Design an enzyme around this catalytic site. Structure first.
Site, PDB file in Angstrom:
ATOM      1  N   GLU B 452       0.904  -1.151   0.098  1.00  0.00           N
ATOM      2  CA  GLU B 452       0.053  -0.028  -0.073  1.00  0.00           C
ATOM      3  C   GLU B 452       0.877   1.217  -0.005  1.00  0.00           C
ATOM      4  OE1 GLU B 452      -4.050  -0.222   0.154  1.00  0.00           O
ATOM      5  OE2 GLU B 452      -3.885  -0.756   2.345  1.00  0.00           O
ATOM      6  N   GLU B 528      -4.247 -10.352  -0.434  1.00  0.00           N
ATOM      7  CA  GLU B 528      -5.414 -10.241   0.562  1.00  0.00           C
ATOM      8  C   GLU B 528      -6.558 -10.707  -0.026  1.00  0.00           C
ATOM      9  OE1 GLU B 528      -4.743  -6.723   2.959  1.00  0.00           O
ATOM     10  OE2 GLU B 528      -2.591  -6.667   2.243  1.00  0.00           O
ATOM     11  N   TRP B 957     -15.545  -3.063   4.555  1.00  0.00           N
ATOM     12  CA  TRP B 957     -15.725  -1.496   4.547  1.00  0.00           C
ATOM     13  C   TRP B 957     -16.918  -1.208   3.410  1.00  0.00           C
ATOM     14  CZ3 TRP B 957     -11.258  -3.969   4.435  1.00  0.00           C
ATOM     15  CH2 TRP B 957     -10.590  -4.211   3.040  1.00  0.00           C
TER      16      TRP B 957
END
EC number: 3.2.1.23
Lengths: 982, 982
Positions: B452, B528, B957
């Site tokens: 990231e 992931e 999320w």
């Protein structure tokens, strides 16, 4: 305190590869911080950019720890005054050096302490940021301002900038710069030149506003046929971000604006978290853009204005924009869709008398000389150059290879640092800060990762960084075999045209073979070729024959511009050969038709005129001028008028030349850019000489043969077997007897790297010395004299032996006829096992010294068997001074080939020979180290050779004379006629 | 002096990205410096490697400048004692944090001052080099030894080593380490976990000889069929080079040597200048090598001995060698020629009670649990791990992705540092020093550039560095869209199987579509996926269906191992689902034939036994055991014997399971590795119930309907319309009336990132709250009671309205027959414009509390509509405590799907329903923040649902419940029968 020398110097930042700078600002394109758009557009000087060049105080110290603490506050009592843009070795402090513990440097590190007292206006300190720019400081330095430590820097060849806002006080200020001679950065700058140290580039103060333009770069995109272009400019700002800030980019051609764009800040969405709030990209559309090239350097002016939404300007920056596309397609390097042919040269930054300090006048002088000699490209030899150099190359037109300051040829594995990840941070700074500075220059078309540093993983990482950051330019790197994965172009050093050099793990293939190796698709451009050290550049025509024939052989860079010229920019004779081989017009003769092919890719021949001339043995017979109308890469057929057909004996020669009637920015009216010569028609001479009534009279003694005819008289030594003296009237004509010569004063190519300590047995001079060519003693075998019906016949035979071995045998015939002429026929046998002799001819020391040398033969300039293409056959008249080439290290020089007649004083020599004439003997040239120690001899030394060995030039350390230019026939014959003014 | 705190801390090295270390030694594989070859071979402890772990003195300070100068000499009087391998936040000094000026850190920087007094034997100081290794220090630290400054370091997750030879004195010594909480390196370690600081890894002293092995790495090359291997070892030495030095590399399988090689120093010719004099490469030939894999971790022992030519040993180093080849061919990641299927999980280094300090026992416990759940790979989540972790993965068998400690997700462009060349030196150190440390481990098969951090040019440069240095492993990187040029593998985060998520500039395509994009050839492995936060992992079977079908979908890594287990390593219910979907045996049923396909690539099923069982409604009928003989990727056909054919009503179920009779290194005898269930044959029930002679009696009042039958009695509230009470004898059975329920306590997937401040309108819980599902009030429409010939009929109709809008309508029928049974039929209408309800069922609070819960239905563990594949249909009996899942944040939990019969105390519920039973109401679960605040209620809360919404899991999320698991039909019917012990 911590500003003291003891604290600052305690960490030894110059012995730590992990510390390359402290408190240094980011790299960027050049900035002037104009506060007016019109001034930025017209490139007027900016009052926000102030130069600190001038008189500084200087003090020298043997080591950094020897500097007293009081230097930080006040100027030393014994400190002298110097002009800061200089090298302190030029002022006589420590010995300059032309020539390991990888992290560490010697403790005896000479230290130069510079100091300057200057004034600062209060307006600069109330608002805005004031910075100081050091364009170049050799090795490393520490900076103090009013006694407070500021920062540290390395990488001598790129600017170092520091923020001085918090350090400057209103009124008088003092700067203290501690320059060290050696640092850990010296291991990456370990090339072969005068080392030198000091502040060798400009020092300046720049004032930027509180909100400022921090960076900008431009990119040009094109359609298929280059009829439409898009100019994308990305502008980055620094400081406080306001919603009323605007950026305007305007494009200007002269005084007319052609494109403009305005936008607020905030870039496109980059990734998940968003985009740059401090960046904006402007896209400007240009219809039918004027493309930039070396032939036609069309430049626009891009003005970047930072201003408020209402319309008030904050700051303006500008740069020159050239519209061009560089890419490699199908193994060819293309510029604007056309295959480039690189007429390149390597150029170091060497001032004629100021060492490493470059100024504009010398740069413009260098650029003019290059373009006048058909060069179109320059390689920045092993480091980034002065910033003004790239601007001048944009304006005049020169392809530039920009090279990172990485050079570690002294390492024993040679990749010991470039394969070490601990040195990756050091090398990355040298590559990235160069790209960030020079990426906006249209002249820069290729990036270079460095020079002679092997091949390590750091090279691959830095290669991929450039490709990501700037995909508009190819990346090249010689090292690890010149064809590794870290280069887009095969760029060998001194690869030969036809001969392979298969060194272990790094072979130097012939360039023709290199292209066709299994799996090889890249273009080949030689980063270094045709070593021009001394009397060199033999075989230069071989390279350019190969360049023309093979599409993927796209040229190269000749080593050492300055070199091809002396320090005072006086040209070498080899510069003429380079100009002729690099002509942009090629010529073909077929009967009465001349075919002219243009090698220009973009321009039309609109400043070109062809002048043709036909001469017979130097006597002009006809001439004419034809205008040239040739499209780029086109052909113009020119039909000559009915050429003269003389019935007198001799060879007809046709000479064409291209003349530019109008002056350009880089040349004056009447400039000759190309020429070519041919043989048209030869009428062999069949007429007999007049029946002279007289007969030369021969007298014989035990010591000599004496031939007498009128006032002339010849004397042959019977013991030596050579002609010893000749008398016209009662005046002797010779000081040294006429004897065979088989040696020459060794050239730099003949010597190689053969020092008196590390002998090189393969060198030509070492083989000649081991074979006894320089020590061979002539022995007379036979010597007879016979009286003919109209002449006197002298026959001699000599043997040159060295240690019970016959090297050469010379059989000579002298025929003195009644007309006064002297015919000399020489037949020479050379042993096959001895190394091939450097020359086969005669030499003598004439008693007379004359002012002019007149000969009918090749070229006005000196020329050699493998460096005579640029020479032309005609009647040449030169002063004796121009017959000698003043090479720094004396050697054989001044040879003129293809000569049919030579006149010097009352003497005339006719035949088919090569000659050199001067006041220095070959013996003196061999023993004299430097040309300033040469002294003229009593008379004139004349060397007339029937045959002469070629000169090298592929490299200077290995034998490079091709087989077709070696004297390997074994048996040789030549004839000479010696007459006088009668 | 310059060793004082004032001088050392003045340059602020922790706020300078250009300074990442000072006086730090080079990175290398782990060294023990054995002085005996046999000890090195058997991995015995070395007396040259001494551990300093234990009791140290500690002092905390708010800022580095608050540390007194006297700390450098003597231990503070108020300093306490701690165990050094620890985080000081775990001792209560400053608050730990789970959650900008890019170069600068806050001035309030907490500082931990560690000190240790230790003894040194004189043998270490007389000869050899003594160094100290800090395996991990969070952020940055300064080191002092006996009051003298040694060095500085960053990059918390890699060892920092310093030379202490010149600093150690004979006798007692003192070390002083100043650990800072924040540095410029914190900007590259800005991930999401407990921040924490201190010396969280081991501290040790290593003694090496004067001439020592400085580095070594091994490479394995193979022929086409892996029958022949070459082991190349390159050994580098440091110190004085002698001609009598030798290096021997020997390969051992157990106690038998299989290969050996000896050579003096001096490597192969590298380039023009030569080769490495301090390096030697040994080539060892291995015939029929035992290959390493996760299935069979065959390991050799390579011993590197530095010794004299006579035979005296100087130093010995050793490492484990696995023979395997990892490469990507035709878009597939191959191990030893076979396509890998990654059963991976992300794992952070989190101790159960010591924070970030890892010890061997916890690592072995984690590895055993992973392999017992069919995991074969682990991703080192965002930083290099403890060195012993990689050794354990070699020995037990686990594919490892090693990740560089680079994480900058907090930057607003997110590539602000990774696109900045000024941060390239900082990031290069984090990548290069990881590769130099771990390149010899066979378990490490993939390098990861970080996590990231967007995509910058620094990523491309560092990607190419790894490819050059270590071409034996692929390089992967998520960032900039997970398919940039800096990755060999498409590695998206939380990409969905079928649904595309086209975000701007970084779209998340569905993995099936991502593979077939124009020009895409790379394999896809999810770095992931399947967020396991709370009650999650719904739709996990969808991923593994896609993994099996598509060759280039080669698996992925489930996020957060610890997560799939609690902190005490107690497993979550979702761990069972992962184990079942990751089985290495797939099963197909065709009539009486079971087809077993092996998913192993290398091993034969030599520890496998198939146990099959046939049951009828939980009653076993037949069973059998068949040994498994399946080749890798082969099929074994197993013909079942003549299966029982009961004539009693019910469904026949066939269950197979694979049992390992023998214990392995990672599992105990009797381990179940795979299972599968099928329905065989169902006999529908046609028999009528017995003709009960009695009739329930109905009494009507103005407040209630009362039905009485024997000792049982029911009461219906006429105002509410719900069954209010039931009496067996005189004992009440209910505390809360039986009412329809349409909501559930929101899961973590239902909430998303919808905080009370940043509301997320798209979240499921926000749509339910805005629609009034939690506030809807039931309104009675009709309620009638009729007496039948043998039963009593109760009919009710309710409407759930919120702000003048009918959300749900429920029509219910109660049929109380004479046998005592109670049939309940429910018909529900759901408005199409309201969001789909989370559940459709009934709830009540039973007055009785019982110890055991017995039901005939799916699975022993909790299961949900999209997480029920691992569950099995049978008769299950569990204590009431096991019916509740203790999630940290309370939510709906404990659901069992596919249930036909449920028994609790005297009550039996029959039908086709899902249920959860516990002591906590859905209301209490919604309002309680943490599970430790949950309190049991008076009775038992029972939720029986005809229908239930699926749980998310693709991410936490965004809404991720698939359409086929949403309650979108609009009309729903289900039936329930409620009887008692009679």
């Amino acid at each position: 305190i911590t500003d003291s020398l003891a604290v600052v110097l305690q960490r030894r930042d110059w012995e730590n590869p992990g510390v390359t700078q402290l408190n240094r600002l980011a790299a960027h394109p050049p900035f002037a911080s104009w506060r007016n758009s019109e001034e930025a557009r017209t490139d007027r000087p900016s009052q926000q950019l102030r130069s600190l060049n001038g008189e500084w105080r200087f003090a020298w110290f043997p080591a950094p720890e020897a500097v007293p603490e009081s230097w930080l506050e006040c100027d030393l009592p014994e400190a002298d005054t110097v002009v800061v843009p200089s090298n302190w070795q030029m002022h006589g402090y420590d010995a300059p050096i032309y020539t390991v513990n990888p992290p560490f440097v010697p403790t005896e590190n000479p230290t130069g302490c510079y100091s300057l007292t200057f004034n600062v206006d209060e307006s600069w300190l109330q608002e805005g940021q004031t910075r100081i720019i050091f364009d170049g400081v050799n090795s490393a330095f520490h900076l103090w301002c009013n006694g407070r430590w500021v920062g540290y820097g390395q990488d001598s060849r790129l600017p170092s900038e520091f923020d001085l806002s918090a350090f400057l006080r209103a009124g008088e200020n003092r700067l203290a710069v501690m320059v060290l001679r050696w640092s850990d950065g010296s291991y990456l700058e370990d090339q072969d030149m005068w080392r030198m140290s000091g502040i060798f580039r400009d020092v300046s103060l720049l004032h930027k506003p509180t909100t400022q333009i921090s960076d900008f770069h431009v990119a040009t995109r094109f359609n298929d046929d280059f009829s439409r272009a898009v100019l994308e400019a990305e502008v980055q700002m620094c400081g406080e971000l306001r919603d009323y800030l605007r950026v305007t980019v305007s494009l200007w051609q002269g005084e007319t604006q052609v494109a403009s764009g305005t936008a607020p800040f905030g870039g496109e969405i980059i990734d998940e978290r968003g985009g740059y709030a401090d960046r904006v990209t402007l896209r400007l559309n240009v219809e039918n853009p004027k493309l930039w090239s070396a032939e036609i350097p069309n430049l626009y002016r891009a003005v970047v204005e930072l201003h408020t939404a209402d319309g008030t300007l904050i700051e303006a920056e500008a740069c020159d924009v050239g519209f061009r596309e560089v890419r490699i397609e199908n193994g060819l390097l293309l510029l604007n869709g056309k295959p480039l042919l690189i007429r390149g040269v390597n150029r170091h930054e060497h001032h004629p008398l100021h060492g490493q300090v470059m100024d504009e006048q010398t740069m413009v002088q260098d650029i003019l000389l290059m373009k006048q000699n058909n060069f179109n490209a320059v390689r920045c030899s092993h480091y980034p150059n002065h910033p003004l150099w790239y601007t001048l190359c944009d304006r005049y037109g020169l392809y530039v290879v920009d090279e990172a300051n990485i050079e570690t040829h002294g390492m024993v594995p040679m990749n010991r640092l470039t394969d070490d990840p601990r040195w990756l941070p050091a090398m990355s700074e040298r590559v990235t800060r160069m790209v960030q500075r020079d990426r906006n220059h249209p002249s820069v078309i290729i990036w270079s990762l460095g020079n002679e540093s092997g091949h390590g993983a750091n090279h691959d990482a830095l290669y991929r960084w450039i490709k990501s950051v700037d995909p508009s330019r190819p990346v090249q790197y010689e090292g690890g075999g010149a064809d590794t994965t870290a280069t887009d172009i095969i760029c060998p050093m001194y690869a030969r045209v036809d001969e392979d050099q298969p060194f272990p793990a790094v072979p130097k293939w012939s360039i023709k073979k290199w292209l066709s190796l299994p799996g090889e698709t890249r273009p080949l451009i030689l980063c270094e070729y045709a070593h021009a050290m001394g009397n060199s550049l033999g075989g230069f025509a071989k390279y350019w024959q190969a360049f023309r024939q093979y599409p993927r052989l796209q040229g190269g860079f000749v080593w050492d511009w300055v070199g091809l010229v002396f320090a005072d920019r006086t040209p070498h004779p080899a510069l003429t050969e380079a100009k002729h081989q690099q002509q942009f017009f090629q010529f073909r003769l077929s009967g009465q038709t001349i075919e002219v092919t243009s090698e220009y890719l973009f321009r039309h021949s609109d400043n070109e005129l062809l002048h043709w001339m036909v001469a017979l043995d130097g006597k002009p017979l006809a001439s004419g001028e034809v205008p040239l109308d040739v499209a780029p890469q086109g052909k113009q057929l020119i039909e000559l008028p009915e050429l003269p057909q003389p019935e007198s004996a001799g060879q007809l020669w046709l000479t064409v030349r291209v003349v530019q009637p109008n002056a350009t920015a880089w040349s004056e009216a009447g400039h000759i850019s190309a020429w070519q010569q041919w043989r048209l028609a030869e009428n062999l001479s069949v007429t007999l000489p007049a029946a002279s009534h007289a007969i030369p009279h021969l007298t014989t003694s035990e010591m000599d043969f004496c031939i007498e005819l009128g006032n002339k008289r010849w004397q042959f030594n019977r013991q030596s077997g050579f002609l010893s003296q000749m008398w016209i009237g009662d005046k002797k004509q010779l000081l040294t007897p006429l004897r065979d010569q088989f040696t020459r004063a060794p050239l730099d190519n003949d010597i190689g790297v053969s020092e008196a300590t590390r002998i090189d047995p393969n060198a030509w001079v070492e083989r000649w010395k081991a074979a006894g060519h320089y020590q061979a003693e002539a022995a007379l075998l036979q010597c007879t004299a016979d009286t003919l019906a109209d002449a006197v016949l002298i026959t001699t035979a000599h043997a040159w032996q060295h240690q019970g071995k016959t090297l050469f045998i010379s059989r000579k015939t002298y025929r003195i006829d009644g007309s006064g002429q002297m015919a000399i026929t020489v037949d020479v046998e050379v042993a096959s096992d001895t190394p091939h002799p450097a020359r086969i001819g005669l030499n003598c020391q004439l008693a007379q010294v004359a002012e002019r040398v007149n000969w009918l033969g090749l070229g006005p300039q000196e020329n050699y068997p493998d460096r005579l293409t640029a020479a032309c056959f005609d009647r040449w008249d030169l002063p004796l001074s121009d017959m000698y080439t003043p090479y720094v290290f004396p050697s054989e020089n001044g040879l003129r080939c293809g000569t049919r007649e030579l006149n010097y004083g009352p003497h005339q020599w006719r035949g088919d020979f090569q000659f050199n004439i001067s006041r220095y003997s070959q013996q003196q040239l061999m023993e004299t180290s430097h040309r300033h120690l040469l002294h003229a001899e009593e008379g004139t030394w004349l060397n007339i050779d029937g045959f002469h060995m070629g000169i090298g030039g592929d490299d200077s350390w290995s034998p490079s004379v091709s087989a077709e230019f070696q004297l390997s026939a074994g048996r040789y014959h030549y004839q000479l006629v010696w007459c006088q003014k009668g």
